[PDB]
A and B are shown apart, each in its own frame.
With several copies, the nearest count.
Chain A
Amino acid sequence: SKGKKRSGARPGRPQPLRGTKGKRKGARLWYVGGQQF
């Protein structure tokens, strides 16, 4: 084996998932020909 042996339990309540992606933004990904809202 190598290197982990950590732990991960947290207290609280399981809040619902909010936003599929996004922790840190880079450059643009999509180009449609203008703004779209």
Chain B
Amino acid sequence: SNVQTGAERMPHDLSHLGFLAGQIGRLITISTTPVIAGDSFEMDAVGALRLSPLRRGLAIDSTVDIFTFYVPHRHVYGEQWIKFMKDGVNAAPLPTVNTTGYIDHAAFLGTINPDTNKIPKHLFQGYLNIYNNYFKAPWMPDRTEANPNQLNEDDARYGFRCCHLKNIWTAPLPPETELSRQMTTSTTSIDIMGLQAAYANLHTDQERDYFMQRYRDVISSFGGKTSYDADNRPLLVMRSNFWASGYDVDGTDQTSLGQFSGRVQQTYKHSVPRFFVPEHGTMFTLALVRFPPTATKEIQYLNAKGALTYTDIAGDPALYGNLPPREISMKDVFRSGDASKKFKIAEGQWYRYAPSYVSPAYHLLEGFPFIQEPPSGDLQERVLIRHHDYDQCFQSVQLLQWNSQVKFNVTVYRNLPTTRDSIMTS
């Protein structure tokens, strides 16, 4: 009888809808699709972004980010792949991972939880690779769970916490920078040629602390290049950003005459141009919603430290360009800050940055997404976003803090037989 060995190249629809929801400052998966080696991928996403109804009207916009990444299966399975592909049919099946038994767990991966509490390993591990290479601070430790059921709630139902927009206290120098370095000398002598060699060792250490925490950064400084296969990192295909706006509604009865309520609704588009898929893998699409980091109790540095010296106030170029970094506390920038929490800044940074001012009359007032109290804990706890800081800004609904409805217009050019060829023997 007739045996088919090849196919022709045709476009495939693969379009679907998007009823999404999430929290603020957490990275959640929006869409996912498998691809084959040799394909071409295209996507237009058109939708609307809404926030929960506000308590008093629109005051500050929020910014929204959409990302698309490509993750090969060889980056996840490694050597179990390759052997799988070389053996062809009759190869051993690929492994899975375990999840907690609920419906809303494994929702940060953009799927409903199966009744068996098992999902493909490449879905979970492909999310960890994106977070560890692009979204955590380079000086933080990596995250390695091996099983989605080892996470807690708010990590399984919603994504992982991300970082604030850069600021004086949300973007400090890494907590490993050295404020001094010693050189061993004799009792009544010093080698001045070895002193010259001690400055060259410190220069390489300071570069590896401010710019070059990752291997791909070290190679780039020499003038070289690394492919994402050499580093085993995902490939960023597209990125979009916008601000979300809306309007107000006026109350008209006896009690609410003079009261307003804000309604955020924004139309957006995420477009990915045609992309050649070199190996089998997955495409991820993710979203992130954030606010500018405004706090009600922040003060200017020169107004908070006690007595002004020449180094603070003069702005002398010979002094700012030759001094080590300065270590300060949370008490120097916040009214109720803790004096035992320290971080390091650059000298003269108070003449390069200006903070926002919030009047004392705004303290503890509903609506108005601010940070009411100075953040507590170690450095990593302060830099990451706490979505409980925005609970008093919205009204309680079932759809969390933001929701979206989107149509994904995907198109892939594959080499597959038609449905007719698959069901007919001859």
A interface residues, Cβ below 8 angstroms from B: 1-37
Instruction: Report the minimal beta-carbon distance from B276 to chain A, rounded to whole angstroms.
Output: 13
Given the contacts A23-B44, A23-B410, A36-B138, A30 and B267 also touching, CB distance less than 8 Å? no
CB pair B268 A32 closer than 8 Å: no
In chain B between 187 and 201, which residues have their CB closer than 8 angstroms to a CB of chain A? none
CB pair A8 B15 closer than 8 Å: no
The 27 listed contacts between A and B (C-beta, < 8 Å) are A1-B134, A1-B236, A4-B67, A4-B238, A6-B271, A8-B269, A8-B270, A8-B271, A10-B268, A13-B265, A13-B267, A14-B48, A17-B17, A17-B405, A19-B407, A20-B407, A23-B15, A23-B409, A23-B410, A24-B11, A26-B12, A30-B171, A31-B173, A31-B211, A31-B420, A33-B212, A34-B212
Q: Which chain A residues border B173 with CB–CB below 8 Å? A: 31
Given the contacts A7-B241, A8-B242, A24-B13, A32 and B270 also touching, CB distance less than 8 Å? no
Instruction: Report the minimal beta-carbon distance from A21 to chain B, rounded to whole angstroms.
Output: 4
Given the contacts A1-B134, A9-B266, A18-B243, A32 and B171 also touching, CB distance less than 8 Å? yes
Task: Output the residue of A13, A16, A26 with the most chain B CB within 10 A.
Answer: A16
Instruction: Report the minimal beta-carbon distance from B242 to chain A, rounded to whole angstroms.
Output: 4
Nearest chain B residue, comparing its CB with the CB of A28: B419
Q: Which chain B residues border A35 with CB–CB below 8 Å? A: 134, 138
Instruction: Report the minimal beta-carbon distance from A15 to chain B, rounded to whole angstroms.
Output: 8
Pick the interface stretch among B33-41, B58-66, B93-101, B359-367. B58-66
Choose one: A2, A11, A29; the contact of B236 (CB below 8 Å): A2
B interface residues, Cβ below 8 angstroms from A: 10-13, 15-17, 44, 47-48, 50, 58-61, 65-68, 134-135, 137-139, 162-163, 166, 171, 173-174, 209-214, 217, 235-243, 245, 265-271, 292, 294, 349, 352-354, 356, 405, 407, 409-411, 418-420, 423
CB pair A4 B60 closer than 8 Å: no
Instruction: Report the minimal beta-carbon distance from A6 to chain B, rounded to whole angstroms.
Output: 5
CB pair A22 B15 closer than 8 Å: yes
Nearest chain A residue, comparing its CB with the CB of B353: A29
Q: Which chain A residues border B241 with CB–CB below 8 Å? A: 5-8
Nearest chain A residue, comparing its CB with the CB of B43: A23
**Majority SS of interface residues in chain A?**
loop
Q: Which chain A residues border B68 with CB–CB below 8 Å? A: 4
Beyond the given pairs A10-B267, A21-B15, 9 more chain A to chain B contacts, judged by CB atoms under 8 angstroms and listed by A's residue number, are A4-B236, A4-B239, A8-B268, A8-B269, A17-B17, A19-B407, A22-B13, A32-B137, A32-B171
CB pair B61 A18 closer than 8 Å: yes
CB pair B174 A32 closer than 8 Å: yes
CB pair A17 B407 closer than 8 Å: yes
Q: Which chain B residues border A13 with CB–CB below 8 Å? A: 265, 267
Give the complex CA separation of A19 and B356 in angstroms. Answer: 11
Give the complex CA separation of A13 and B356 in angstroms. Answer: 23
Choose one: A8, A16, A33; the contact of B213 (CB below 8 Å): A33
Instruction: Report the minimal beta-carbon distance from A14 to chain B, rounded to whole angstroms.
Output: 3
Instruction: Report the minimal beta-carbon distance from B59 to chain A, rounded to whole angstroms.
Output: 6
Choose one: B66, B210, B266, B267; the contact of A33 (CB below 8 Å): B210
Task: Output the residue of A5, A15, A17 with the most chain B CB within 10 A.
Answer: A17
Q: Which chain B residues border A6 with CB–CB below 8 Å? A: 238-241, 271
Q: Which chain A residues border B134 with CB–CB below 8 Å? A: 1, 35, 37
CB pair B210 A20 closer than 8 Å: no
CB pair A9 B60 closer than 8 Å: no
CB pair B240 A4 closer than 8 Å: yes
CB pair A33 B268 closer than 8 Å: no
